[PDB]
Amino acid sequence: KETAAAKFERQHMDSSTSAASSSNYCNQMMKSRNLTKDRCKPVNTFVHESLADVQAVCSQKNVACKNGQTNCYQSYSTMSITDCRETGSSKYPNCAYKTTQANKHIIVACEGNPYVPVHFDASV
Template identity: 35%
Template sequence: MAMAPTGPHPVLLLPLVLLTTGLAQLSKGASASYQQFVRQHIDHPKTSAPNDRLYCNLLMQRRGLTRRRCKPTNTFIHAPAGQLRDICSSGGRPVSRNLYDSNRSFSVTTCRVLPGSRPGRCRYRAATGVTRVRVACVQRLPVHLEPTYLP
C-alpha cells in the first residue's frame, strides 16, 4: 500500500499565498501613497526663491501639480520627512479613523491658484505661517494632508 506524501497541502497553501500577496500589495500601495505625500507636501529645507509667490509658482510646477490642471490649493511643509512620519505614532494624536493631529507646529507655505490660471500658465499666491497639521495615516505613514488654513 502506497502512502501519500506528507507535508503542506497545495489547497491549504493557496489562502496563505493570497493573504501574503494581498498584504504585500497593501504595503506597496501605502508606500506609493506616502511617496506621493512627500512629493506633494514636503519641502525641506525650503527651496530658495526671491519671494513666496515665485516660490509657489516654482514648486507647484516642479512637483508636477500643474500638468493636467492648476491644482487649486497645496501646502508645503518645511520639516524633515521623519517628523511628518512621527505624526502617525508618537508625534501625533488620533482624531478619528486614520486622522492624526500633530503634537507640534510646523512652518508651512500654502499656495492658492490665482484666477485666470491655466495649465502651462498656473500662477499662485502664497500664505506662510506656523501651524499644526492633520494627516491621514496608513500603516503608520502619512498619505494625505488635510487642508491647512492660513490667512
C-alpha cells in the same frame, strides 16, 4: 506605480528650506513637483520640516478626517508650512498661485505598514 506614501512626499515635503522666502515660491514649486502637468492642482501645502518630524505626526493626536474616517492625526506642535492656492485668473497651462507662509499644525491621514502619511487633510 507611485505608492501613496511617495506621492505624499512629492506633493507635500520641502525639507530643503526653512520657509518660503518669496511670493513666487508656489509658482516655482507647483511646477517643479509636477503638480501642474495635466491640470493646475488648485490647493496644496508644503511642509518645511524633516521627513521624520512629519511621519511622527502619525503617532500624535488622533482626529477625524474631513471625509469622516478616523485615521487622521494632528501635530502636537506647529510646523513651518507654505500654503499654495491657485489664483482666480489662473488658467491651465499658465498656472498661477498665491503663496502664504505660516506656522500651523498639520493634519494628515496615515496608512500602511509602516504607518505613514498618505494624505494632507488641513492645517490649523
